[model samples]
Target: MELIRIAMKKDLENDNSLMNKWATVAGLKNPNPLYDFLNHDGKTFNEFSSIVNIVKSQYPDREYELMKDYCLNLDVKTKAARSALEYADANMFFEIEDALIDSMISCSNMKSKEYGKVYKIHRELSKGEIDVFEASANIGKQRIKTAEMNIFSKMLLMYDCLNKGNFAPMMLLFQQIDLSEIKENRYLKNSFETRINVLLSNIYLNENNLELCREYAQKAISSTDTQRFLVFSYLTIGTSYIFSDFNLSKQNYLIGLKFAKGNPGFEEFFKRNLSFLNNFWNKENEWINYDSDAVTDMQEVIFELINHKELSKALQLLNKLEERDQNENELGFHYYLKGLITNEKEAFFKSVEYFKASQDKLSIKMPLIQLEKMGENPRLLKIITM
Candidate 1:
């Protein structure tokens, strides 16, 4: 058996490719073929779909339970790495493993040792070194990769969505995909584009110049070999619709959530949007309409002011929203929204005052959410807003 020192963590960034090598070395020290198979060719048993081939030839279809028992027993004797480092932390490996596995299992997985490298990472990072930011970022990136991997486990699952007559979440997947990353991923980029067009022709009925929302959904579906992206895509666009089309939105949202419960790929993406949906639905009573007519009237005034290069006049027109409301002080956010458009032609200090006021209002109106979500708070992750 070949010997190697494999990386325990998937996102070791620097050390990931070393895992199979370490496993090979461990086997040479102990002289075990099964160890070589489990650690190297299998590369964390579940990582290999071929494991089914190996196991299938040895066991009857009804004997899958027996196969699992036999393989798990072999796994125990072969691994000498009872302790290993993980995520740059020497001792937190076990804890992180537990946390990761718990979260993973909440989404459910067969006990096929698919996450062996992830589990072994606990052993490696359990000993020494520290880089919390790097480790956390690595883990975060790996989580995204894992979600992507889940979709590629079966080719047919990818085809299931394109089968037609089945609303299989294809449109939803296209809306959430981030295609900027596709250039680096050849298989994902090619496969996704090819499959999505078929569905695009069927549902959207538009073949050329796909919009960002539609593109996102399509790219997301194509990223995975399986079309499980359909569910996640559905939820993402559904949440987006709360601001536009409210009726058809809920059914899509529920279906996305249902699949996300069992599919790890959709889990975190599903969780991240819940609060946005809740607020969109539940906070309408607290949401002041901000006078639709007033908004329309102000835009015309803004256009006229700009048409003559009257920058100060534009500012004055924007300020009127608050000035005209004599009975109650206009919430600071209304001014902040105006500042976004007016800042192009107005003074920095003037725009800053509206923004600061908007921040103050946001703290009260939606204390639970980030100020940036208010749309008027120009700040994005420590880069200060002008």
Candidate 2:
């Protein structure tokens, strides 16, 4: 953060690279005279708001409208914490770790809230490779800490596990905390409960328990009238029916898309999956444009390979992905692809065996349906979308 004034179109029209530099740092994408460029294409509204806060805080003496929401006392630490978030929005987690290394070190040793929960959350995620291992605990028993701090950390952890496509740890974390406490949390407000239900439904979907998945998603849809929660509820329920009913899946995806309009992240997500499903449904060979940075990138690539019938390249890519590391969340889909491309009954059974250990049981949908059609043994499926 630098001592920079908030520059508008009139104030910033004069010849100044220094102003341009800080303007770009504040929110602009390019070094231009017209500083009214609010948010560039890849930046989020939240990230822009954070950058504004950083810039406003630089002028400590002045009271800005946005700064009114922030604590005036802990201004420096708050800016550092938010600036760290801006760094993450740009996919630079290393910058957060670098800047807050000392704060994190001291916090770790003392377990102090002095560094702030935002700092602790970033430190936890950015310091090392994320641990997908389920650090299971006794149900209903949580190690004592300040109540609000724990809730904030758990929410971040929940989203962390969700984005990683790892549902088991998310499930374990779910069992440890009481959702009742979250209901009263001010910030999370009305939508968090719905969010929890959606997440639980997705977790169940991945756990090979379609019944539980639908149960929770239905609960979410019934509970939340809000667009964000409702959209995800539809998304989960829609994907859950992919194996069971194409028509139903299409309806839910359509409903979710309507609700997801304003939120680019969710809109893009539903669009990607919906497009993938539409391609499969229509039997069209047109290549899809999915998010290249998504955690499900490998799964998407394999699906395309199956579509193109490039089994050899699919296997090669699969093996290369395996060589790096494979989360069980991904392994089921991997085995499913392997089984589909191999085109043997034995291979299909082998995939089922591997899928028993996988959280994402829906990947087995196709081969299972094919096996049933051909009169193979008893049944078998994304934890997230499933």
Candidate 3:
């Protein structure tokens, strides 16, 4: 394990072209000046809440802060773990990863690209390839040891499986990893629980067991050992309630929305789904059904809301997208997304006119075209005014 830790560090500081090879192996961008550390400071459990502590320690020294600031200013990722000789680096990476993970959970929709990068690193780490860095680490010399790389590696693999849209195998791998063992490590255990809850909640939803799904959702919220995970679980619970739990639905959705309000990504996620659900709830016929191009429509509407300065509307749309249950055309999806972005840049009146003009060009009527179908007549359409 110590060898592996050393190897990973070498991979980060790869002097030759091997960095690229390692990056390819790990599905991570070479830990260059911009995207090296997979961990960040803020994400660490500065105030440990859950039974398992997410971070082992904190940086109480100026040197630690200086290293972090250097990473931040240089656009270098400071999330990589430091070895025994480089305890400073390890501590720094831990904090960096905490921040990164937090950002991912809190702003997943907005930071999809960044989220993808994190997944890339996860995939790369899963390969179990021992590079020169691992070879370089000597127990007697550098006094470095691996912090149960296999546990971290397996966890990384699960993350890759998640981002690649492969859930079943990922879940199976998770089962094999023996979470109880991982949980024994207080730092690793709490982080693992948060990730597990997120995966489990989603799985329960896939199984169509809203009761169990909501239960996982509750677990997710309760395991607030990590704030990053709370937001993730909140979104999951909100979605479950939006569809099946009639009574507690809004309460869950609002909890998710409250967090989403602070993050554009979550806001987008909420808005997309909320809009779709609104249409479904009201039986609005005009807005496309969840089955008919879910991503495209949600992306379009969310951007529109954002552009119109209707952040709340965007959040609602994201909620609708999450529960919509389908993937649509990719090309049209981007156009819809761009439209939303354009609207955000333009003022409210300008954006509305722009939306109207754009729809008209496409031979789609404004208001009427955008309305969520509710009942029989034009008057029955669910339209949100100002």
Candidate 4:
């Protein structure tokens, strides 16, 4: 732990490379991946994670978890830094990961308000305290109401807001980014514009408004030729067609796969959604593959299984979904499962009712769509909001 502390303290200093200082602390043991990674041929977080996993198996039971936490925390930094490093600022990220480790090791995470906000926001979004989708979205607007951040920090906060689904603040953040700073880099300016449009495109699809979804998504693709936004943008537009048609959906998925090789953030989502789309492609019609997880991964694949009366595996996931106290968002999903298995109009409407309560806008439509196919007339209410 002290070595971890020592290495970080030095790495934070302006004189040296983070990995160089880290290697000095790690020791020059021969024939070790840690030595190999720290000394040579390593440039990314995935490489870092690989060595840490090796060490966890090579030795164990002590400091491994703590270091792994740094490793994991850096994973979060990588994505936020990725866009900035490529388009925003190259200098900050080189030492910033090390800077984060120093704050972490010194237990000074809250020293800066944004740092506190960063960690707090991460915990807020990740923890089960208020697991409902929009429930946690009520992170109280006043928490970050002021404007006292550097451009880099400001951009970092914007990325987290998207991750946390704080859709309201994201709009304000885009406007506040003050595009003139990066106006020197034409690509950077276009990339920032793409982020805004893609967010809206993703939201439009969730609201089942495909026309507007494609408009802004195509607009985003027009401006930014880069991968991060473009890959997700393709997905935003591609998924819009999945509900209505699979041909264009397949086309966009193939294009997205070319850029999404590293999984940026949406790879699993792309893969899972792609899997469902491909289910119709084969003549034999075998289900496509996805990692089975009740919580993190979607249960749509499981729902497909249940659609065919494969109740044994479906029961495992269904029971897991019901095993604990579910928040409104989860309950929204649970009710869908209930509706799916029972095949009763009551449970179908129950899922729709819970979906409406959760305001998961992404999910409410499925239940309503189900109602129509189940030979029942569904009602639509168009309430005007001024």
lDDT of 1 by residue, 1-386 (tens): 21111212322346654444543433333324434554564333322222322333333242334332333323321211111111112212244345444333333333223334344332333333323234334334445343323332222222344443333455454565554554333333344453454345334321122245555665655554232456646664565455455554555566677756654646545543443344344422221222345443344445444445677767676777655552111333343334444543223333334444443222122221333444444444223321
Better of 1 and 2 by TM-score: 2
lDDT of residue 81 for candidate 2: 41
Expressed as tens digits, the lDDT of each residue in 215-334 for candidate 4 is 999998887644567787888777788657778987898788776776545566676667666543322223345565545344665566665778788777777667776677767666
Best by TM-score: 4
Cα TM-score per model: 0.27, 0.50, 0.43, 0.53
Model 3: per-residue lDDT, tens digit, 191-296? 5565677777776665456789778778767765333566677767766666455446556656777765655666656555555455434433233333445465
Kindly report the root-mean-square deviation of model 1 from the true structure over all alpha carbons.
19.2
The global C-alpha lDDT for each of the candidates, from Candidate 1 onward, is: 0.39, 0.55, 0.44, 0.54
Better of 2 and 4 by lDDT: 2
Model 1 local distance difference test score: 0.39
As a whole number from 0 to 100, the lDDT of residue 93 in candidate 4 is 28
Alpha-carbon runs more than 4 Å astray in model 2? 1-115, 126-145, 153-176, 179-185, 189-195, 218-232, 259-268, 279-343, 350-359, 379-386
What global local distance difference test value does model 4 have? 0.54
Candidate 1 backbone clash number: 40
> How much is the lDDT of residue 74 in candidate 3?
25
